[PDB]
Structure formats: structure tokens, C-alpha cells
Amino acid sequence: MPPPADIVKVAIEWPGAYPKLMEIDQKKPLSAIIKEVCDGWSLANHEYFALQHADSSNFYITEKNRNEIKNGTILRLTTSPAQNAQQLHERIQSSSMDAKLEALKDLASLSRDVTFA
Amino acid sequence: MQSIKCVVVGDGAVGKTCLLICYTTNAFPKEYIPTVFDNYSAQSAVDGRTVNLNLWDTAGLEEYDRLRTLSYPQTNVFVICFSIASPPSYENVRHKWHPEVCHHCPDVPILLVGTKKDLRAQPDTLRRLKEQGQAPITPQQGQALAKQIHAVRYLECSALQQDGVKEVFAEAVRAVLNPTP
Predict the structure, then answer these.
(1) Across the interface, which of B5, B36, B37 has its CB nearest the CB of A18?
(2) Which of B27, B52, B67, B72 has CB 3.0 to 4.6 Å from B3, enough for a Cys bridge?
(3) Which of B99, B93, B172 is nearest to B137 (CA)?
(4) Closest CA to B85 of B50, B128, B49
């Protein structure tokens, strides 16, 4: 009789801020996970946040490749892909050369996903 | 009510994994299991103030020096565990910890607790330390070290006996509330 696996440990990092601990169940839809995260952290605008993998891949969570999540793995929170696309589009015609350089570099580096493309 | 970030460090091979397991499961396993990193978020309220204990596990391996030094700057509090009667531990502390924490941030409260004190009841470690011609650190030198590292009040807690740990955390919080000018 194997022990239950419904409980997992995972830390969600932030840029410049230390992580917080919560249990995430991948069986439930991502909408439910986002709603539970927002309820736990008392954060509004659930549609403006998403999840990503902080490993060498630096990819977001996908329905076909979500099994790479393992206990005791560094994961950091990022901005939602819609907001990232909007800010990249805004900075495409920006007045700063360095901003254009970094935006194009980030777009080229993070262009390995099909659905977000 | 102000939740503050925390980092827990210590000397190599002191029982960090055992402490983490005790904190997460209320047990005391003598078995040693390798651990890369851990982070515990505890919601503990003391003296009417709600501060979240953002525990952080650290590794003393040479490969992860950059990872450990990433969070060292701008740290607000440290939880350091070291051997009380290890002259090499004192030498390492004096070489690495105190000068850096003093030069970088003069106004960061630091909590220090001495460990490896329940081994006195075991004659094995006494014989091991006896054959090398080593003597226990004198209490006066230990008190001088405690008072010379910019510590308001030095206190120790026992993990095997489960005595004073909560008191140590509470007094550290009180010292943070009313630190030196």
C-alpha cells in the first residue's frame, strides 16, 4: 500500500524576494491552481499571473511537458505571458537603444514555445 | 506585523538536515540524509507581531559558493549554528563570518546559537579529542568572543533536549525590536 502522493513541497521564488511554500496539485486545471495561489497570497487580477520553470530550460508550464516538476527544485514566479508580450510590443518602438537590445534578446531567447508563439 | 526575510547557515556537518526534519515533522532522526536546499515558511506570532519565518537551508560545498553568496548581501537576519568547543570552527568564523557581516552591513541583527554541547555524555568523542592533545575552549574566551561580535546578548538552545529554541527565537525577535543605537 503506497503512501499518498497528494502532498508535495515546492517553493516559488521571486526576483529580489524570498519564496513562499504551498502545495500544488497538477491534476486540477491551471485556472484552479491560479485561483488557489491568488487566494493564498491575497493577490488580485488572477489573469495577470502565470507559472514557469526556473531550471535551465526557463520555460513555462505546459499541458504536455508538466511532468518535469520535481520536489526540491528551484522555481521562480514571472509575469504573465500576455503582459510580457504587451511590454515587448511597447518597447519595440521605444526611444531607448538598450531597452530594444534587451527586449529583442529576451524575445529571441524565449521563443522556444509553440503555444505562446 | 512586519514579516522579515531570514537565512539559516552554519558549519559543515552539524545536523542541518536533522534540524529541518525536526521542524517539518516534529521528530529526531539520527540518520543522515543528504540535502541540497530547503525553504520553510512558518507563520509564528510573538508579542502580538506576525512575522513569517522564511527559513533557508544552505550548503557548504565549494561548487555552490556563488549560489550561497547570492543571498548574503542585503540579508536582514542570520541563524548560525557552530560547534562550541571546536577551535577550527572559531578560526573559520573569525576568518569568514564576522569581518564580512561587520563591513558589509553594520546594522543587520544576527542570531548566533552554539551547538554540539550534548556530546559531553558520550565518552567516545571525549577520547577522540583527548588523543590529539586538545582542550575545551575556556568559558572566558567564549564570552569574550560572544561580546566582541557586536551581540546584545548571546544565548544557546538545545535541540536534542528541545529546550530554549522557542525562547531563543523570541529573544532574538525582541532584540530586533529594540536593537543597539
Answers:
(1) B5
(2) B52
(3) B93
(4) B128
Q: Do B38 and A19 touch (CB under 8 A)?
A: no
φ/ψ (deg, to 5) at A10: -155, 135
Helix (H, G, I), strand (E, B) or coil at A34: helix
Helix (H, G, I), strand (E, B), or coil: what is residue A97? helix
The residue of chain A nearest to residue B38, with distances taken between CA atoms, is A72
Closest to A52 (Cα-Cα) out of A28, A34, A32: A34
Contacting A residues, span 33-72, partner chain B, CB-CB under 8 Å: 72
- Contact (CB, 8 A) for B134 and B126: no
Number of H helices, E strands in chain B: 7, 5
Residue given cell 491552481 in the structure block: A33
Rg (CA), chain A: 16
| Helix-, strand-, coil-residue percentages of chain B, each rounded to 5 | 40, 20, 45
Resolution in A: 7.0
The DSSP bridge partners found for residue B39 are B56
CB neighbourhood size of B111 (10 A): 21
Q: How far is A39 from chain B (nearest CA, A)?
A: 16
Experimental method used, please? cryo-EM
Answer yes or no: do B41 and A20 touch at CB < 8 A. yes
Cell output for A101: 537590445
CB contact under 8 A, B41 and A21: yes
Find out whether B16 and B80 touch, Cβ atoms under 8 Å: no
